[PDB]
Design an enzyme around this catalytic site. Structure first.
Site, mmCIF file in Angstrom:
data_model
loop_
_atom_site.group_PDB
_atom_site.id
_atom_site.type_symbol
_atom_site.label_atom_id
_atom_site.label_comp_id
_atom_site.label_asym_id
_atom_site.label_seq_id
_atom_site.Cartn_x
_atom_site.Cartn_y
_atom_site.Cartn_z
ATOM 1 N N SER A 265 0.859 -1.175 0.000
ATOM 2 C CA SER A 265 0.000 0.000 0.000
ATOM 3 C C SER A 265 0.902 1.234 0.000
ATOM 4 O O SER A 265 1.723 1.377 -0.925
ATOM 5 C CB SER A 265 -0.944 -0.127 1.195
ATOM 6 O OG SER A 265 -1.794 -1.237 1.063
ATOM 7 N N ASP B 222 -7.958 -2.346 -7.822
ATOM 8 C CA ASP B 222 -7.569 -2.112 -6.437
ATOM 9 C C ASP B 222 -8.616 -1.272 -5.713
ATOM 10 O O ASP B 222 -9.087 -0.257 -6.237
ATOM 11 C CB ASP B 222 -6.206 -1.422 -6.395
ATOM 12 C CG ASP B 222 -5.698 -1.226 -4.987
ATOM 13 O OD1 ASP B 222 -5.055 -2.151 -4.448
ATOM 14 O OD2 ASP B 222 -5.942 -0.143 -4.419
ATOM 15 N N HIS C 143 -7.202 -5.393 -1.866
ATOM 16 C CA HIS C 143 -6.153 -4.458 -1.475
ATOM 17 C C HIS C 143 -5.179 -5.182 -0.556
ATOM 18 O O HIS C 143 -5.602 -5.783 0.436
ATOM 19 C CB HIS C 143 -6.748 -3.227 -0.776
ATOM 20 C CG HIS C 143 -5.755 -2.136 -0.523
ATOM 21 N ND1 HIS C 143 -5.046 -1.526 -1.535
ATOM 22 C CD2 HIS C 143 -5.352 -1.546 0.627
ATOM 23 C CE1 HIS C 143 -4.250 -0.606 -1.020
ATOM 24 N NE2 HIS C 143 -4.415 -0.600 0.291
HETATM 25 C C1 LIG Z 1 -3.858 1.363 3.095
HETATM 26 C C2 LIG Z 1 -3.845 2.090 1.757
HETATM 27 C C3 LIG Z 1 -2.473 2.487 1.307
HETATM 28 C C4 LIG Z 1 -2.331 3.325 0.023
HETATM 29 N N1 LIG Z 1 -3.007 4.587 0.312
HETATM 30 C C5 LIG Z 1 -3.115 5.409 -0.852
HETATM 31 C C6 LIG Z 1 -1.789 6.040 -1.269
HETATM 32 C C7 LIG Z 1 -0.598 6.009 -0.553
HETATM 33 N N2 LIG Z 1 0.330 6.660 -1.231
HETATM 34 C C8 LIG Z 1 -0.205 7.136 -2.387
HETATM 35 C C9 LIG Z 1 0.381 7.892 -3.438
HETATM 36 C C10 LIG Z 1 -0.386 8.265 -4.534
HETATM 37 C C11 LIG Z 1 -1.731 7.899 -4.605
HETATM 38 C C12 LIG Z 1 -2.306 7.158 -3.577
HETATM 39 C C13 LIG Z 1 -1.525 6.776 -2.457
HETATM 40 C C14 LIG Z 1 -4.323 3.973 0.576
HETATM 41 C C15 LIG Z 1 -4.483 3.371 1.964
#
Ligand SMILES: CC1CCN(Cc2c[nH]c3ccccc23)CC1
Ligand SMILES: CC1CCN(Cc2c[nH]c3ccccc23)CC1
Ligand SMILES: *[C@@H]1O[C@H](CO)[C@@H](O)[C@H](O)[C@H]1NC(C)=O
EC number: 3.1.1.98
Length: 354
Positions: A145, A253, A300
């Site tokens: 993530s 996702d 996810h």
């Molecule tokens: C647990 C999930 C982890 C990822 N996050 C989104 C995210 C993290 N870094 C990013 C950089 C660009 C665009 C979206 C994201 C969502 C929660």
């Protein structure tokens, strides 16, 4: 079952100034090391960081961290659960910087919180070298993530860091899970006025200023001042990396659909074509990524789930694909490394999780 170590260098802190750290299970009969980066959104201004401290404090502080924590999925030491690297040295780095692992700013007069994600990694590597990492032959930097995006942003530093410290023989690699996002057009639109209406492109550009965020140097030189937010998106930053990186990404996702303002709970023409286009575009961004695993599922994260061995693409599971990737870094008969689904709707792959 991994044991907590708080960083000896107390200047490298979580958001609230408490010391950062890592969990370690060491395997003396192995020269393989696995460093995993936790995920969990981010915060890009005072107000949303304040709310995060009340309801997600473990992602902002080490105050209430447990002493041990159990290893799951790729961090498991049992072959039954981890066919890939069960005998490797295991490291879990908690995500307490809220900066997608990019920040390099301390708390002080002018900063209510510290954002030191890039420096937290940097120091974990330093202190691990005095606990056996000095004799390693492969260091795999993995994450899920926001930690998956952190792998893409940080894998070449760890490589450059180990050479400047005199360890050019350690092979640094990366494994990015669910951190390959698209800055695509949204299904429904809102202007950036608060946390929940700000699209990731706008939220990340404000975050980099707020965090003093840092991106890989070659990507930085391409997009230049004040366009550094481009480097948080996988298909833009990946072509600038020299370390080998394996990319794991569900085609549909859940976090990507969330930032696209899509909810699934009676689907029509409007939304059917949108979802189908999303799978097509992200398949396109992976066509030339030689090491990848992209099933057509709505989910996810995966690599630290205990049942990560159940999902398959064209008959090949994820632990097998990673093992084939190790072999290729020494094309392999019946042991593939590029695995991307071609069917166009969520869960058209029968091995998708329930
Ligand atoms: C647990 C999930 C982890 C990822 N996050 C989104 C995210 C993290 N870094 C990013 C950089 C660009 C665009 C979206 C994201 C969502 C929660
Ligand atoms: C030692 C830990 C860190 C400080 N304290 C709360 C706190 C005091 N000042 C702050 C500024 C920003 C965010 C949190 C705090 C909790 C335990
Ligand atoms: C502690 O970490 C900070 C932040 O990266 C660094 O500037 C400093 O040199 C480190 N100190 C030691 C003794 O390693």
């Amino acid at each position: 079952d991994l044991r907590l170590h708080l960083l000896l260098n107390t200047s490298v802190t979580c958001n609230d100034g408490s010391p950062a750290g890592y969990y370690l299970k060491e395997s003396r009969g192995s020269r393989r090391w696995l460093l995993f980066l936790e995920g969990g959104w981010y915060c890009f201004n005072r107000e949303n960081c304040d709310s995060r401290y009340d309801t997600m404090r473990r992602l902002m502080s080490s105050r209430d961290w447990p002493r041990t924590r159990t290893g799951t999925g790729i961090l498991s030491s049992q072959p039954e659960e981890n066919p890939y690297w069960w005998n490797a040295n295991m490291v879990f780095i908690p995500y307490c910087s809220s900066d997608v692992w990019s920040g390099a700013s301390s708390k002080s007069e002018k900063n209510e919180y510290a954002f030191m994600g890039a420096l937290i990694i940097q120091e974990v590597v330093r202190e691990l070298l005095g606990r056996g990492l000095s004799g390693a032959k492969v260091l795999l930097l993995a994450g899920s993530s926001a930690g998956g995006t952190g792998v893409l942003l940080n894998v070449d530093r760890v490589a450059e860091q180990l050479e400047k410290l005199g360890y050019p023989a350690i092979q640094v690699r990366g494994l990015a899970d669910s951190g390959w996002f698209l800055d695509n057009k949204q299904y429904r639109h809102t202007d950036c006025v608060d946390t929940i209406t700000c699209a990731p492109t706008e939220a990340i550009r404000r975050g980099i200023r707020y965090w003093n965020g840092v991106v890989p140097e070659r990507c930085r030189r391409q997009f230049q001042e004040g366009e550094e937010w481009n480097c948080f998106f996988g298909y833009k930053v990946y072509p600038t990396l020299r370390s080998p990186v394996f990319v794991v990404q569900w085609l549909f996702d859940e976090a990507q659909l969330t930032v696209d303002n899509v909810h699934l709970t009676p689907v029509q023409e409007g939304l059917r074509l949108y979802i189908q286009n999303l799978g097509r575009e992200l398949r396109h961004t992976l066509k030339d990524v030689p090491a990848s695993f992209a099933p057509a599922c709505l989910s996810h994260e995966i690599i630290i789930r205990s049942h990560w061995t159940d999902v398959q693409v064209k008959g090949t599971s994820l632990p097998r694909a990673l093992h084939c990737w190790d072999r290729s870094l020494h094309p392999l008969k019946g042991c593939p490394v590029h695995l991307v689904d071609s069917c166009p709707w969520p869960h058209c792959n029968p091995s998708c999780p329930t």
